[PDB]
């Protein structure tokens, strides 16, 4: 269920960190990140994503330092990193 505080796939910030809420239609396919093949990469497994951020619910979690919005695990950006790789 989307949070008030959701990341936007539209939002600037979202923008600026080239995020997709649904990373099989992000561009990670294109930027390729190592750590794991692209299509395993999102949200859910990104180093510093927290569950703990408070406000967190379904599909929705804290975003390394994404202040007071929520992205969904389901979701990419270019800052993407495994967590441990
Ligand atoms: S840094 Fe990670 S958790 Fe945050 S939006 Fe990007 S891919 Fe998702």
Same mark, same amino acid.
């Given at each position: 269920?989307?949070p008030? *505080?959701?990341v936007?796939?539209?939002?600037?910030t979202?923008?600026?960190?080239?995020? *997709?809420?649904d990373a099989?239609?992000?561009?990670?396919?294109?930027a390729?990140?190592?750590?794991?093949?692209?299509?395993?990469?999102?949200?859910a *497994?990104?180093?510093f994503?927290q569950?703990?951020?408070?406000?967190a619910?379904?599909?929705?979690?804290?975003?390394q330092?994404?202040?007071?919005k929520l992205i969904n695990? *389901?979701?990419?950006?270019?800052?993407?990193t495994?967590?441990?790789?």
């Amino acid at each position: 269920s989307a949070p008030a *505080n959701a990341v936007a796939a539209d939002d600037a910030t979202a923008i600026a960190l080239k995020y *997709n809420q649904d990373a099989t239609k992000s561009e990670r396919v294109a930027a390729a990140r190592p750590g794991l093949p692209p299509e395993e990469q999102h949200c859910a *497994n990104c180093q510093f994503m927290q569950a703990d951020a408070a406000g967190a619910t379904d599909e929705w979690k804290g975003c390394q330092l994404f202040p007071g919005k929520l992205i969904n695990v *389901n979701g990419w950006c270019a800052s993407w990193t495994l967590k441990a790789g």
